[PDB]
């Protein structure tokens, strides 16, 4: 049955609640972003109104074959009305098309649902600055002080330099980058760009990125693997057997793979700086795990909340265990008491 944290009180609204059939008393279904845990249950046969971003809308039409008359895409940073309730979509700095949702209830309460997000100081100059928030439905994915990671910028700087070095030293080396859902595109595109190559991929994944409105995307991506020296594969294939397999398929066009697994966090971040990362190697294959997160770090999260000073916080992630819930409520109390709200 739909959990309480996916229901917006005093509205007929749900957020990311498509896996519970017809939810009792839901007149409108919100979808923050196109990841499987959140869209789980959508299909062509869905006949309720879905509200989402333009990009998330394109992917619902094309990838899931949802009928067009049920997709209500909304522009960002714009006051819209839905079943007589004022709403706004803000950029979540997650994956493409991903949004946070502000709800202005008729009684005067104001609710921010972050969806999935990576908190940034640039959010403190959106429509969020203008007014108070009573409730915050917070993506608490890395809600613990051990979760630290570098900026997306430094991680990219690392990947670029690394990849440029390897391929200048060996022109017959192939770069491979792992993917399983939309998001993390800057990794593979920045590497392609610095190498003067396009990114080769499967047709299904080429179709997916074509939905997103990237600038000059046709310039960046392709389905001709032969003409490319940056390949994308499923994340599952990023291991020594998978990569040896794929190397075989390229027919003596390459003799070496360098490969990246963009993960969220790894316990190597507790001990090791980004400059100090090294790969796993077996034969002519090297695999780098890099900490490119699309979620808030502990510190970014804490700052975001202390800036916003919400009256109540409802966690949306890691809620399934009593020790987790409890550890989060402790940090929430620290953040409140430190900041004096
Ligand atoms: Ni997500």
From Swiss-Prot:
Keywords associated with the record: Cell cycle, Cell division, DNA damage, DNA repair, Hydrolase, Isopeptide bond, Metal-binding, Mitosis, Nucleus, Phosphoprotein, Ubl conjugation, Zinc, Zinc-finger
Cellular localization per UniProt: Nucleus
Tissue expression remark: Expressed in brain, heart, kidney, liver, pancreas, placenta and skeletal muscle.
GO biological process, one term: double-strand break repair via nonhomologous end joining
Result, substituting residue 139 to N: Impaired nuclear focus formation, reduced interaction with PIAS and increased sensitivity to cisplatin
A GO MF term: 5'-3' DNA exonuclease activity
Induction and repression of expression: During mitosis. The mRNA encoding this protein contains an internal ribosome entry site (IRES) in its 5'-UTR. This 5'-UTR generally suppresses translation while specifically promoting expression during mitosis, when cap-dependent translation may be impaired.
GO cellular component: fibrillar center; nucleoplasm
Annotated family: Belongs to the DNA repair metallo-beta-lactamase (DRMBL) family.
Protein's job: May be required for DNA interstrand cross-link repair. Also required for checkpoint mediated cell cycle arrest in early prophase in response to mitotic spindle poisons. Possesses beta-lactamase activity, catalyzing the hydrolysis of penicillin G and nitrocefin. Exhibits no activity towards other beta-lactam antibiotic classes including cephalosporins (cefotaxime) and carbapenems (imipenem).
Description of how the protein assembles with itself and partners: Binds constitutively to TP53BP1. Binds CDC27, which is itself a component of the anaphase promoting complex (APC). Binds PIAS1.
Name assigned to this protein: DNA cross-link repair 1A protein
High-level lineage: Eukaryota, Metazoa, Chordata, Craniata, Vertebrata
């Amino acid at each position: 049955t739909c959990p309480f944290y996916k229901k917006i009180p005093g509205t007929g609204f749900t957020v990311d609640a498509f896996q519970y059939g017809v939810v009792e008393g839901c007149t409108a279904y919100f979808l923050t972003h196109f990841h499987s845990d959140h869209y789980a249950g959508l299909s062509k046969h869905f006949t309720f109104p879905v509200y989402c971003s333009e990009i998330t809308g394109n992917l619902l039409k094309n990838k899931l074959h949802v009928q067009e008359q049920y997709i209500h895409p909304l522009p960002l940073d714009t006051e819209c009305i839905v079943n007589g309730v004022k709403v706004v979509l803000l950029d979540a700095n997650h994956c493409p098309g991903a949004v946070m949702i502000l709800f202005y209830l008729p009684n005067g309460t104001v609710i921010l649902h972050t969806g999935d997000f990576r908190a940034d100081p640039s959010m403190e100059r959106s429509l969020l600055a203008d007014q108070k928030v009573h409730m915050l439905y917070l993506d608490t994915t890395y809600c613990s002080p051990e979760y630290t990671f570098p900026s997306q910028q430094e991680v990219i700087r690392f990947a670029i330099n690394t990849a440029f070095e390897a391929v200048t030293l060996n022109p017959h080396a192939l770069v491979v980058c792992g993917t399983y859902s939309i998001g993390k595109e800057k990794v593979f595109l920045a590497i392609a760009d610095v190498l003067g190559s396009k990114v080769g991929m499967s047709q299904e994944k080429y179709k997916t990125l074509q939905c997103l409105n990237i600038p000059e995307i046709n310039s960046l991506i392709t389905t001709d693997m032969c003409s490319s020296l940056v390949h994308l594969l499923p994340m599952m294939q990023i291991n020594f057997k998978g990569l040896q397999s794929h190397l075989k398929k390229c027919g003596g066009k390459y003799n070496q793979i360098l490969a990246f697994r963009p993960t969220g966090w790894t316990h190597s971040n507790k001990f090791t700086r980004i400059a100090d990362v090294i790969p796993q190697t077996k034969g002519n294959i090297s695999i780098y795990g890099i900490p490119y997160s699309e979620h808030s770090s502990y510190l970014e999260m804490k700052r975001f909340v202390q800036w916003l000073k919400p009256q109540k916080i409802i966690p949306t992630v890691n809620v399934g265990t009593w020790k987790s819930r409890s550890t989060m409520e402790k940090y929430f109390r620290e953040w409140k008491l430190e900041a004096g709200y």
